[PDB]
Amino acid sequence: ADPGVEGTPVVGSDLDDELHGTLGSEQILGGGGADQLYGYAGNDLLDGGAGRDKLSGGEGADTFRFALREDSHRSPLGTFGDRILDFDPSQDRIDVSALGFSGLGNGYAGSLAVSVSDDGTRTYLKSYEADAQGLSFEVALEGDHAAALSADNIVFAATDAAAAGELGVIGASGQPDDPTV
Ligand SMILES: [Ca+2]
Ligand SMILES: [Ca+2]
Ligand SMILES: [Ca+2]
Ligand SMILES: [Ca+2]
Ligand SMILES: [Ca+2]
Ligand SMILES: [Ca+2]
Question: Hemolysin-type calcium-binding repeats at which positions?
């Protein structure tokens, strides 16, 4: 075995990249260009920067923090929402407080309302808060686990875990039939 990492933010910040990271914890920043970022194993921190970025968190509890208000957002000019390949909605988290919103919008089961492209292709998650300038937050996911997304893994509560976990999904009811045929 021989290390010699070609990834990490050390190279290609302002232009399109292919960064393959280590099997340990890292801070990954894409910078400019449509980057292909791969965090792999370890608890990683990931920012995309300018452009529509394609990114994997990999194994470990990852933090998709993003750079500024100008990252993973939509504006009247067009969308710049990033494209996450393998987000784990149980283990990983996505920050949005400094860049998008602090109060979650419309949604149910402790979530934000999800969207799909069609029968296939990517799924999306949207925030329904926007700036008066039309700067809103949306992000695309191609793992198609929209059915498991929750606002619990969307971190706007300053990473404080004193609250949350409030669910009322539990329950049972029925209308039984009694045929004799
Ligand atoms: Ca780059
Ligand atoms: Ca980028
Ligand atoms: Ca890593
Ligand atoms: Ca980006
Ligand atoms: Ca990882
Ligand atoms: Ca992960």
Answer: 30-46, 48-64
What experimental approach yielded this model? NMR
Dihedral (Cα; 91, 31, 129, 90), 10-degree rounding: -10
Interstrand relation of 54-56 and 36-38 (parallel, antiparallel or unpaired): parallel
Q: Which residue has the tokens 């969307």?
A: 154
Q: For residue 32, how many C-alpha atoms fall within 13 Å in the half-sphere facing its CB?
A: 4
CA of 176 to the centre of ligand 5 (A): 48
Tell me whether residue 127 is exposed, middle or buried, using C-beta atoms within 10 angstroms of its C-beta: 0 to 12, 13 to 18, 19 or more: buried
Report DSSP state, residue 55. E
The alpha carbons of the chain give a radius of gyration, in whole angstroms, of 19
Domain span at residue 39 reads 1-181
Is-contact 107 151, C-beta < 8 A?
A: yes
Overall number of domains in the chain: 1
> Which residues neighbour ligand 5 (ion) by CB within 5 Å?
39, 44, 57-58, 60, 62
Residue 22 to residue 110: CA distance in whole angstroms: 34
DSSP 62-93: -EE--SSTTSS-EETTEE---EESS--TTT-E
